[PDB]
Amino acid sequence: DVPWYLEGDDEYELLLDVKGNIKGGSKEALVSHLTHHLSLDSNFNAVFLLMFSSMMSLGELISLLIARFNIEPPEGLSYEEYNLWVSKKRNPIRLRVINIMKLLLEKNWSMSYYNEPVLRRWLTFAHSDQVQTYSLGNLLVNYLERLLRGERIRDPVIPNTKPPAPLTKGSSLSKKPRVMDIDYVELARQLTLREFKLYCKITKFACLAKVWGKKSGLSESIDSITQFIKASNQLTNFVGYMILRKADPKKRVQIIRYFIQVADKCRQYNNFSSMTAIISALYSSPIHRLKKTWEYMNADALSNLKNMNKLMNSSRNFNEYRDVLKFIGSEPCVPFFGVYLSDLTFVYHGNPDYLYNRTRQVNFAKRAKTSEIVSGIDRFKTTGYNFQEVPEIQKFLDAWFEKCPTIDEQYQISLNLEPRE
Numbered sequence: 175d176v177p178w179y180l181e182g183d184d185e186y187e188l189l190l191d192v193k194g195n196i197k198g199g200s201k202e203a204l205v206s207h208l209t210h211h212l213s214l215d216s217n218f219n220a221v222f223l224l225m226f227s228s229m230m231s232l233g234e235l236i237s238l239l240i241a242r243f244n245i246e247p248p249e250g251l252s253y254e255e256y257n258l259w260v261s262k263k264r265n266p267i268r269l270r271v272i273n274i275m276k277l278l279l280e281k282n283w284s285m286s287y288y289n290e291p292v293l294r295r296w297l298t299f300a301h302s303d304q305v306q307t308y309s310l311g312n313l314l315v316n317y318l319e320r321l322l323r324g325e326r327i328r329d330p331v332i333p334n335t336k337p338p339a340p341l342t343k344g345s346s347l348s349k350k351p352r353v354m355d356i357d358y359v360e361l362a363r364q365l366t367l368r369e370f371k372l373y374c375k376i377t378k379f380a381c382l383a384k385v386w387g388k389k390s391g392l393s394e395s396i397d398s399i400t401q402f403i404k405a406s407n408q409l410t411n412f413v414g415y416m417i418l419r420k421a422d423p424k425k426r427v428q429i430i431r432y433f434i435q436v437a438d439k440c441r442q443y444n445n446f447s448s449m450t451a452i453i454s455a456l457y458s459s460p461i462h463r464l465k466k467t468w469e470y471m472n473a474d475a476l477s478n479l480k481n482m483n484k485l486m487n488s489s490r491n492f493n494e495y496r497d498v499l500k501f502i503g504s505e506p507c508v509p510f511f512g513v514y515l516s517d518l519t520f521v522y523h524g525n526p527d528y529l530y531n532r533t534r535q536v537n538f539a540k541r542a543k544t545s546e547i548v549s550g551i552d553r554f555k556t557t558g559y560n561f562q563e564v565p566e567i568q569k570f571l572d573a574w575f576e577k578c579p580t581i582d583e584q585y586q587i588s589l590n591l592e593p594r595e
Contacts, residue, residue: 182210279321280317300315330506342356347570362437378551386544436448440452463592
């Protein structure tokens with residue numbers, strides 16, 4: 175067994191579940207467990223480093239970590255007992271503390287964490303003789319110095335396969351081209367390229383900042399998300415407006431079937447963001463009420479649209495979508511980002527930030543659930559899409575995405591295009 179002075183620290187302030195896993199604890203207890211000298215929990219360490227700002231500030235974490243590095247022995251130890259305490263507890267704790275700081279800087283750093291007094295205290299710590307005897311001491315100094323002068327401490331892979339030839343040469347399109355002058359497969363490719371580029375800019379920190387808000391402890395910009403949501407709203411506005419610009423119902427039905435084919439080709443490309451944005455416009459009130467136009471729709475196109483709507487049934491928890499996303503793997507994919515947000519929003523509002531309303535009993539299990547959800551967004555940044563970009567179509571989409579009115583404003587256009595009886 176272990177002598178009494180070589181046991182863990184602050185463990186009486188940990189709270190465990192049925193399986194024995196940590197469900198909660200105090201700031202001191204959680205950090206003590208993060209730098210435990212006897213055992214190492216990689217899963218705990220990963221969840222804590224990702225979610226720590228929702229539980230404590232950077233300055234509190236650094237202070238608690240430095241206090242662990244400078245841990246004092248309990249009073250009354252004999253000289254021999256103290257030497258054993260140094261070799262078996264303090265020095266292992268110092269290794270854990272330094273390695274945790276390395277992981278914090280290398281894999282769990284948000285620029286919003288920047289705090290010059292904390293960094294300068296941290297830097298002073300890294301300069302200390304006791305830290306400099308470790309090899310990582312010079313690396314800690316190098317990281318903190320770069321963070322202090324504004325420097326930053328990845329891209330999805332594209333296979334060596336030949337890209338498919340673009341189905342619509344940009345030079346063949348007129349200066350003011352019609353949408354259906356673009357091959358629907360090629361439009362799906364270009365929608366997939368712009369959506370995936372916007373998707374890869376979304377960090378986990380931005381997701382935590384959008385859902386948790388001020389409790390996240392992240393002043394990170396959610397601009398990556400707002401641009402991604404803007405692109406989906408614009409694609410939905412664009413789809414409805416291209417339909418409502420056509421005056422002949424026999425021409426509106428061709429535009430709709432064109433967009434059904436686009437959304438379906440996006441589904442084949444594992445681009446569920448653009449596909450959901452397209453069908454949401456088709457099911458929107460201004461387009462859904464075009465009874466004279468849908469009378470022309472072939473059963474084949476209607477089935478494909480219904481199947482895509484069954485796939486992304488929000489009222490049925492996206493059940494079929496979840497079953498399909500589970501088997502993507504290494505294939506490139508633009509997921510429907512709305513599912514991540516709702517999952518995160520559900521666990522943020524369904525679980526308390528504290529256990530039994532005790533401020534010193536932080537609900538760590540709530541952070542663990544959130545960590546498992548938000549970490550999924552990285553699964554689909556591993557491999558990118560091998561599609562040749564057509565700038566003429568990219569500029570064409572940029573122009574219309576800004577010009578189109580909202581779906582709500584398009585309701586009046588629908589009422590004039592097909593009046594009520």
